[PDB]
């Protein structure tokens, strides 16, 4: 009788009954919080962890389980296979029938009324005694620790070995796994033994167990199933997981019946009980219930995070919002297919697409009235869609349709078809130039910088005057500034006009003079920084041309002049040995160049001149220099409580933060100076020093009498 | 020697909530899941949910989570589908599956009239 | 979801002939598809599991073939006991799908 896959007893005494037929335990046991005589010698092996917490009235576990021999462990609770915790009126640990305590340590605390602790060798019944922990009980001092046997040497003592006041600790002979009395029972056999070195005749097996027998793995076609059996292919074929919306059956993987796949690994189309290797990142397909995902909100794209495939539809309708192509980025950024269609309708906030990145694959299961798998309508301000040359994308059925989207330039979408793959595919009026490019610049001049000039913090950079196609054009122009760690840098990455996501925009005038070209001066840079800057024309037409032009800029990367390097961050100092000391170190913040080298300085501290004058025989206290259970108790509440619903030397440290300084007077105070310097420091000079103090070790010996 | 029992026919009025019984015999109760499956007509065979003997937990049908709930009995073997808020569309004869896995449903009980009566 | 759509609703057969019955999926399915056999006033049985292999009980005279969307059912030497309606079910993915349900009437 297997009893799982985890028993939690708690609150009625009377609940207790549900062991009455169980001679093994699959999974954990909980006898919690609970307030007669209860006998249960059908129970000899429990699989994970055993766990009781306040039993009022319970004297001896002998009372319960009196037959427990094997506590596998096969998960354990924070590292512990058996916790006795705050048991009340409990006297002794009665398990006088446990032999093998597989896996875990044991931890036994706040017992006032527990003896018998010290009289149990548990180097015998499990292995790792080092992580034991036994705090909070009766004292052994206080306690009465009698016999009514044998005895070995337990830590540097050698005394009785007992259980209980009437039943002994058994052991098995030297010769051995044995019998009640000096019989070595079988190898793969485990406790005790109903008959001698037999398979069907042990009380709990080693490795694993199969139709009565020990075997040592699991029959060809068996599996392992939790850590102790093992079963056939259609015992795992009807287990579920734990329900969900994405919950499915037990797969079969490396002869073992997990729950699900481990990790690099999916399941098998069709065959879907086995695991097939995925090389890649494996994806993580999301399924909702609702057949078209609207995405009114960066709330509502949150269900989104981390989904590789969806199965469903994409409607985006996003009005208003905070910094939306960062943040939709994060978490529609790794969708890669869609099944159904999208549709980009109302997004007013959305200047590009560009937040759906990984997104290759459209198919187009279900596709809007008229055959439609890709549908934008009213995006007031969407300039481009995320189709630039550098993205793929595949529709694999339906058509196109583009209306009232005044700032998309209508060449942007006949490039779209040519990846999409559905070029003579859509209608007439599918892509109409009517409402779409109806206030879209598409063909700009060149605005072309003349001359930039560089420091360490400001940068005056001018590009030449532009007279617009039209006489009576008011021209301004706009700046576009932005730290850019390398060149892949787009000019869409705002939204909106709000969108101040990334590009600093200033506006600065036509000169009135024409002699003098327009020109910006930046001011407050990093030092040592690469920028992006572009200029943008500001050409407000009195004749509304439908022949928009404008002008626009190359994308110019300034990186500013070289400075002096910070500080380095957090030095700490050691000493390991005399005239020998230890120092780490962190780069500085702001760098301000190429990390060349570091220059380490340490100097001689001098002996408190105070010290030498006081009379040490009168003062009491003498100056001394030196050189160089609550969160279990948590987590047992975590998880039971549910509710319910001197000159300087200096030296150059070439390549690391770290370095060691040799030949020092042992236990000497020292001044540790460490400066930082660039590729620009031979001329700009080397950063300031963080500097510590820090004492050597003392000479072993060295402050004795030297003599008779 | 498997077999499957199901309750008797049953008659009530909208609204009201049912459930249905059915013991196994014959085979290990907790080695194989039970299916529930729906026949309104007789053209119309309607998989409603998966219940594991071993664990407890469901798979329902989409279209019957907010309708049905299946539950298990390990010591007396016998599983039960229970259905709430009972229309004239769930006047249905409804069967127990199990002695086979998550994909077949080897051997049927003999199945369960329910007739939602005005 | 996924549907399944079985090709012939009504089948007038004498006893004695060779019928084929057809079931057809939607998406693309290996195997993963079981027939039925319910007689009237019964229970449906199991026939043939996953497309092909076959079940200990029933008779030789039934086999099934088939593989991905076309799926079918043969009826070597239809018999007296043969008549009935036949179902076929999905269970590649979730959730699993019957048939329509081919009547299989006398002549």
């Known amino acids: 009788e297997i009893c799982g896959p985890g028993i939690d007893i708690r609150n009625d005494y009377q609940q207790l009954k549900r062991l009455e037929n169980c001679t093994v335990i699959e999974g954990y046991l909980h006898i919690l919080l609970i307030s007669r005589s209860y006998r249960f010698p059908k129970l000899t092996v429990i699989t994970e962890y055993l766990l009781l917490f306040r039993v009022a009235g319970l004297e001896s576990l002998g009372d319960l389980f009196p037959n427990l021999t094997v506590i596998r462990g096969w998960k354990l609770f924070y590292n512990y296979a058996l916790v006795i915790f705050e048991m009340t009126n409990l006297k002794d640990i009665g398990l006088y029938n446990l032999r093998n305590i597989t896996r875990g340590a044991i931890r036994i605390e706040k017992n006032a009324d527990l003896c018998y602790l010290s009289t149990v060798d548990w180097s015998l019944i499990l292995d790792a005694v080092s992580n034991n922990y036994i705090v909070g009980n009766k004292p052994p001092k206080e306690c009465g620790d009698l016999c009514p046997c044998e005895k070995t040497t337990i830590n540097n003592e050698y005394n009785y070995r007992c259980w209980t006041t009437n039943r002994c600790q058994k052991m098995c002979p030297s010769t051995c796994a044995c019998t009640e009395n000096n019989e070595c029972c079988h190898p793969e056999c485990l406790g005790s033994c109903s008959a001698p070195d037999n398979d069907t005749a042990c009380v709990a097996c080693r490795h694993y167990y199969y139709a009565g027998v020990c075997v040592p793995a699991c029959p060809p076609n068996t599996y392992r199933f939790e850590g102790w059996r093992c079963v056939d292919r259609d015992f795992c074929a009807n287990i579920l997981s734990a329900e969900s919306s994405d919950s499915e059956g037990f797969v079969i993987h490396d002869g073992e019946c997990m729950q699900e796949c481990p990790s690099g690994f999916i399941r098998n189309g069709s065959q879907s009980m086995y695991c097939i290797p995925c090389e890649g990142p494996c994806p993580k397909v999301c399924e909702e219930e609702k057949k078209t995902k609207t995405i009114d909100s960066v709330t509502s794209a949150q269900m989104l995070q981390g989904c590789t495939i969806f199965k469903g539809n994409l409607l985006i309708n996003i009005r208003r919002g905070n910094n939306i192509a960062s943040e939709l980025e994060n978490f529609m950024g790794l969708i890669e297919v869609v099944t159904g269609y999208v549709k980009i309708r109302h997004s007013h906030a959305l200047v590009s697409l560009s937040f759906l990145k990984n997104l290759r694959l459209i198919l187009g299961e279900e596709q809007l009235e008229g055959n439609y798998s890709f549908y934008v309508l009213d995006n007031q301000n969407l300039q481009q869609l995320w189709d630039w040359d550098h993205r793929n994308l595949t529709i694999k059925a339906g058509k196109m349709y583009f209306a009232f989207n005044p700032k998309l330039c209508v060449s942007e979408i006949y490039r779209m078809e040519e990846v999409t793959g559905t070029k003579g595919r859509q209608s007439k009026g599918d892509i109409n130039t009517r409402n779409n490019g109806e206030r879209a610049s598409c063909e700009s001049d060149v605005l072309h910088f003349t001359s930039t000039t560089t420091s360490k913090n400001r940068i005056i950079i001018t590009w030449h005057r532009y007279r617009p196609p039209d006489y009576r054009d008011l021209i301004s122009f706009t700046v576009y500034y932005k730290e850019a760690p390398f060149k892949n840098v787009t000019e869409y990455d705002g939204q909106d006009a709000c969108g101040s996501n990334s590009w600093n925009m200033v506006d600065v005038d036509l000169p009135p003079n024409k002699d003098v070209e327009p020109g910006i001066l930046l001011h407050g840079l990093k030092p040592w920084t690469q920028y992006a800057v572009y200029v943008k024309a500001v050409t407000l037409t009195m004749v509304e041309n439908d022949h928009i032009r404008g002008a626009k800029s190359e994308i110019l990367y300034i990186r500013t002049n070289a400075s002096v390097p910070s500080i380095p961050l957090d030095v700490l100092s050691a000493s390991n040995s005399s005239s020998q000391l230890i120092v780490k170190w962190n780069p500085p913040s702001l760098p301000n160049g190429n990390l060349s080298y570091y220059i380490v300085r340490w100097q001689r501290q001098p002996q408190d001149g105070y010290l030498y004058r006081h009379n040490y025989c009168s003062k009491d206290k003498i100056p001394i220099r030196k050189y160089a259970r609550k969160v279990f108790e948590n987590f047992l509440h975590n998880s039971i409580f549910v509710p319910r619903p001197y000159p300087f030397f200096e030296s150059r440290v070439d390549n690391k933060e770290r370095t060691v300084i040799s030949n020092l007077r042992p236990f000497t105070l020292y001044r540790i100076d460490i400066h930082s310097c660039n590729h620009e420091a031979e001329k700009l000079g080397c950063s300031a020093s963080n500097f510590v103090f820090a004492r050597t070790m003392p000479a072993e010996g060295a402050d004795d009498i030297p003599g008779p | 020697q498997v077999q499957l029992q199901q309750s008797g026919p049953d008659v009530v009025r909208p609204g009201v909530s049912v459930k249905i019984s059915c013991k196994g015999s014959?085979?290990?109760?907790?080695?194989?899941?039970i299916h529930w499956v729906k026949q309104s007509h007789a053209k119309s065979l309607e998989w409603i949910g998966v219940?594991?003997?071993?664990?407890?937990?469901?798979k329902y049908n989409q279209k019957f989570k907010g309708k049905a709930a299946i539950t298990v009995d390990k010591s007396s073997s016998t599983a039960y589908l229970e259905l709430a808020r009972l229309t004239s569309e769930d006047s249905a004869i409804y069967y127990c599956?199990?002695?086979?896995?998550?994909?077949?449903?080897?051997?049927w009980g003999q199945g369960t009239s329910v007739t939602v009566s005005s | 979801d996924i549907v399944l759509t079985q090709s012939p609703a009504t089948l007038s057969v004498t006893p004695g002939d060779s019928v084929s019955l057809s079931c057809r999926a939607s998406?693309?399915?290996?195997?993963?598809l079981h027939w039925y056999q319910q007689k009237s006033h019964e229970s449906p049985r199991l026939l043939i599991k996953?497309?092909?292999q076959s079940i200990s009980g029933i008779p030789s005279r039934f086999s099934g073939s088939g593989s991905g969307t076309d799926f079918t059912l043969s009826i070597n030497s239809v018999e007296t006991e043969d008549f009935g309606m036949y179902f076929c079910?999905?269970?590649?993915?979730?959730?699993?799908?019957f048939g329509a349900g081919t009547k299989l009437e006398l002549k």
């Open positions: 599956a199990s002695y086979g896995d998550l994909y077949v449903m080897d051997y």
């Open positions: 014959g085979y290990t109760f907790t080695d194989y899941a």
């Open positions: 219940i594991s003997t071993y664990n407890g937990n469901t």
């Open positions: 998406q693309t399915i290996s195997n993963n």
């Open positions: 996953y497309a092909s």
């Open positions: 079910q999905q269970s590649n993915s979730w959730p699993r799908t």
